[PDB]
Symmetry: D2
């Protein structure tokens, strides 16, 4: 009768460096990266835990975490322990530690068992903090207890050619994991649906007591790189019972989302695409869904403003999404996403632009196919997107032609 989320703790691995996002993550961990206009990536998993009814959340942090920790401290500040709610921020440090960082994703939980055991949750819900997706974890929890599994693993149903870039679960007709393979050149297909392979999401459910014993034996193992995907999980698939849970079963799909939505935004192109796709008439991700809302940190902000309408300048946005506290003053916006605080000045033009918070666009600048980092001041008259070899020498530029622009890159300019 009782929901099992009542007795579960969500534990979010938020130590991801996000290496292939390059300078976008030079001073932030990937879970702290802005997404979608107002939120950060970490907010999806946290909101899934919230919307699912989980009232104890732990977040393990690591690489360049001040920015993530501060966002966590003020967006996620409303859990009250007297109501059996908790939100613990757990950066690798010198606690019982006194040895720098976490040795791996399993160590990120092991080091904080002293936090978990007093709460005594019945179930642990391990989550990757660096993906955008909406999911109701109570489905996973019921499957796990109904199946008698030692671990239940969330998996996407992906066409097997696309599955080559994934950790792939080899499943029988009972959906038991009979093998796990890192990045198979030929991914094992699902029995009876061999065009698709199951791609591990990095979402794991255990009984808390089993997991604590498993972490402890892993910690005593010198062989171990102290990682779920490489050490913990392969052990269970061999000598224990590992079961696959299908994202399509638990994904929360608004009526305006044509398929289960999940994005890794692991490269600059992917990050640009997922943000820019929110400018579509019918986006893949419905940021207007009220049924499974995404909480994040937000401030009371003034509204967006458009000024100037003369022969030579008009402030306007077309096929764009514009956040609060944006002043579009004689600037022409097309197919662009502006986060909070942006200032675009007269005669500047933006096309195919992902513009992070508090950016300033100087007069006469013209930019196409760009990601502009937080707080960048674009100088007057700057042109991006016209000359590929000039843009490549000045900025981080993808093969497909997207330019990521940081303040340090601007600072090095006078051509």
């Amino acid at each position: 009768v009782q929901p099992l989320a009542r007795d579960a703790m969500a534990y979010v691995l938020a130590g991801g460096r996000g290496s292939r996002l390059k300078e976008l993550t030079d001073r932030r961990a990937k879970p702290a990266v802005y997404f979608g206009g107002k939120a950060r990536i970490i907010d999806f998993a946290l909101s899934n835990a919230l919307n699912s009814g989980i009232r104890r959340i732990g977040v393990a942090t690591q690489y360049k975490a001040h920015d993530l920790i501060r966002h966590l401290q003020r967006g996620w500040d409303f859990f009250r322990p007297e109501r059996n709610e908790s939100f613990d921020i757990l950066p690798a440090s010198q606690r019982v530690s006194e040895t720098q960082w976490y040795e791996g994703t399993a160590d990120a939980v092991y080091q904080n068992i002293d936090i978990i055991e007093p709460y005594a949750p019945e179930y642990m819900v391990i989550l990757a903090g660096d993906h955008i997706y909406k999911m109701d974890y109570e489905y996973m929890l019921q499957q796990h207890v109904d199946s008698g599994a030692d671990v239940t693993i969330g998996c996407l149903e992906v066409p097997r050619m696309e599955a080559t870039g994934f950790g792939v679960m080899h499943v029988n007709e009972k959906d038991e994991i009979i093998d796990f393979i890192e990045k198979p050149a030929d991914p094992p297909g699902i029995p009876g649906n061999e065009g698709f392979a199951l791609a591990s999401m990095g979402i794991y459910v255990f009984h808390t007591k089993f997991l604590m014993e498993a972490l402890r034996r892993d910690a005593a193992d010198p062989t171990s790189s102290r990682d779920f995907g490489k050490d913990i999980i392969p052990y269970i698939v061999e000598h224990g019972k590992a079961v696959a849970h299908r994202f399509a079963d638990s994904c929360v799909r608004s009526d305006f989302e044509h398929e289960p939505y999940w994005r890794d935004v692991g490269t600059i192109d992917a990050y640009w695409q997922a943000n820019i796709d929110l400018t579509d008439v019918v986006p893949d991700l419905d940021i207007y869904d009220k049924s499974w809302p995404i909480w994040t940190y937000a401030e009371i902000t003034p509204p967006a403003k458009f000024v100037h309408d003369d022969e030579d300048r008009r402030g306007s946005a077309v096929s764009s999404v514009v956040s609060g506290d944006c002043i579009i003053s004689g600037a022409a916006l097309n197919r662009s996403l502006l986060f909070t605080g942006v200032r675009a000045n007269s005669y500047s033009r933006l096309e195919n632009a992902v513009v992070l918070p508090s950016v300033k666009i100087g007069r006469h600048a013209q930019l196409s196919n760009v990601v502009i980092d937080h707080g960048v001041v674009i100088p007057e008259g700057l042109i991006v997107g016209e000359d590929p070899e000039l843009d490549a020498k000045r900025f981080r530029r993808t093969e497909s032609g997207i330019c990521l622009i940081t303040q340090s890159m601007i600072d090095k300019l006078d051509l």
Copy 2:
């Protein structure tokens, strides 16, 4: 040495019905009317008290107060008594009286004395809750203390011809009030500067013990209409000492505000004018000023979205202010201010439009010079601002061509 605001409490009168605002205040008192894109009228006085350092606030309410009380409960909820802050909502009901409503502005303070005296503030700052202005009440506090006045009155400096519609304080050369005239045909000028008269703002400062003793005499006097402006203050001007405080000395002007800003928005024209002027390139009210911020009730909302760009339709805003959670779908906005949550659909057009929260504009509608009430659903193809005689018959149309449109007006059409 100590700032006097520590020992002051603000008392806001928010029973004002907004009569000449007509259907706009049929379902909500004037202080609860929306202004500027996000806030409500009452948030200005409240934010003034907060920014000036006043830690105790009471608000007297009366006429259709549910919206007002719901706004105060949800937005002004962060005061903690252990920190010697308080925020009291004081409607009229079955208190220590128990039958009817408040008898007047002074009665609205006298009925709730049992709440004031336990706080024992040294100063009462009496404020009207139905005007838009920014004021640092610390200046008025120290003038009252240093003047020995029984009451210090906030007064606007106004060219005499426009002072004919105000309560006007006839003042001497020490700025002491020697008479008070309700709407003088030829308002007495300021001595030595006879082009200007002093218009009462309805802002009154007292020592608390004097105010209580004065409120009790008024309550005893069965001939009193139980009002500040017409009973109490006319007595102190005669037998006591009343001193005027000039708005210009304490007004908080942004760098981008060309003069002290104060608006009553008492008419549909004044209300339309004050909102629409926020679409100016240089507005008189700088709503982006961060040095004296206006607090209000706000929720996390999605950003604003502009969509469709073909030969028949383009979603976009020009010379316009658009709040969050607005979707401009193939609609063309110009010189318009949209509060939060508006949906404007394909082929619709808005010009000189003040659009309150949650409005839906049907496809192909075209509206010019309008105030659209909260929640109104505009039917497909509706035209306003083309035929004055038809517009006047369907809705409330001002002397100047502004149409106020309410849901009940929309229900009556189709005949």
Copy 3:
């Protein structure tokens, strides 16, 4: 799979005057009556709904409810609509109704249908807000959906002689209600257990749309006194399907509670008894339980302090419960419960005393078997509990010897 409480709105009936509490409810509704040392009575129903996972709460109050509304504003202020939470305070008022009073328990919901319908909850959980008990409403929701009932009713299983003051359900083989009798002088008994009767808790579960329709039918019928127990429920017992849910199946019992706990505290004796029993070594109600906590309004308070220890006076408490902000200054406390903020001075003695917040006990006063109302100042040397005839003349005194003491009574006296 999904918890039923996700789709429910708890609607708390908090209009009840509790007239048999006499002077205890003269200046506050019964749901605002303090209980247990910190909380108020309404806090149990509200905490039950919170702990059961219901995210939408409405509370119906009267207009004699300034105390109750202030408590809900300050204490139940942490719901955010963006997270699909809502807390609605619904007093009887002139919203779109003109009249300022609710006709009865059914009308208290009918008048606010315009609030419930936009939320569109799948289920309504109607609760009486004037009882002390702990209950997991998810059980009742699951029974209501699986039984197909038109209304499920929460029922205490009690000996039939004590069922004589309740509304009682006669019920068949499968716990379906075949008849409802109001205070039967000889109540019907359960099949296979005709020694016990099922007495109505005033807790009702409906499918939301059924309830709205039934609430509309009832508002039309002028025979109806506008009540759930008198009108709505008996209607459906006859014409529809009513099923009883037994409190023993969903009561939340701490390990230190020997049976399911529900109390009415409808008489002064019962109120006194329920509070004083908390000073037992093993109380019936475990207020130290963390698994089902009671949320309330609380402030940071200084600790309790006991002072003086000479031949004449000792400040200490024996077999007693003492709250924060309490100074027991040379006073002797035995089997007494002190709410927050009490001051008891030298040579005073309290025994069997339920002492509400902010009470002051003057020196040399001696009080026995009393309930002392909020804020009462006891004069030095007052004796209560030694002279039955004189206590009776001077205070509210029960048949059992408990004296209720209000400030009104204290003032009336020199003898």
Copy 4:
């Protein structure tokens, strides 16, 4: 005109080890040590800034301050940047720096200049976060700007023999500092009263721009140990102007505090004494003063409970302070201070005991003249305070007879 606290940023140095508190700070920084029954030491300085009107607070901690940072996250969480409030937690780390450690008190501010300067405060109020005192910083701000000093230094007026442990400021008739000597064996006195000497409170006021330039002067000097007391303060007395502000002018004294109160509880003796003194009839520190309240992290806790009263046992507290969620089960308490959550079981005795949160006293245990660490479980029948030689063998014992007891010592115990 305006209070100067509006333009001030309080900057709290909270890195101190508190080494001569020994095992009491083995895993907590000194500012995070509990004091008074509920608050922690850092809360006083923080509350001073809040009650003084300062709205921007910075707190420098030394990296692995997990208990301190968690305290600030949960307790000091109510500052909203949209209202120009800010509360920043700044641990020594690697964001724009990389040193892993703050090289001194000056370096603790220097490293976070990039946080301070965007706020553009006009004044900096540098505070030591490891002392217990109540002070209104507005008085010190007025004097700093009225006197034109470069630095203004808070100082206590103390007898010279007791000043030998402090940084001492030699004064003149104008209270201008002529020299600063660290720990003078024979301290200079003050003109007109040479029985006393000015001891540095470690509180400094600067004009923000002077301080920034000063911090940049210091960093570029390899001679400097990057310390406020060692380097920057003496620099200015010699070359610039430094002026003494005397605590007695700005200390916030209750009606019941017989002299300005300040403790640095640097020893175990001092810590014990300052806490046990709150058990007095007339304590030096009035923890019941509601006019300069101490804000802290707190939860809704159950009341305190005293149970059992036969000839074998009696649970009671005499001349003691007992916090919430304390259960005194058949335990004898006298002149003891109990923090929240303490459980004392039958036949146990506490005397001259300072008992930190969540301690469990086993049955038959009898402890005298102790400080018991957070969360310690006292074994059944343990005796402390009867054998000085044995107690010294098992615990940390001061010369004066005070035993400090941690769980580690308890675990090492057979005899």
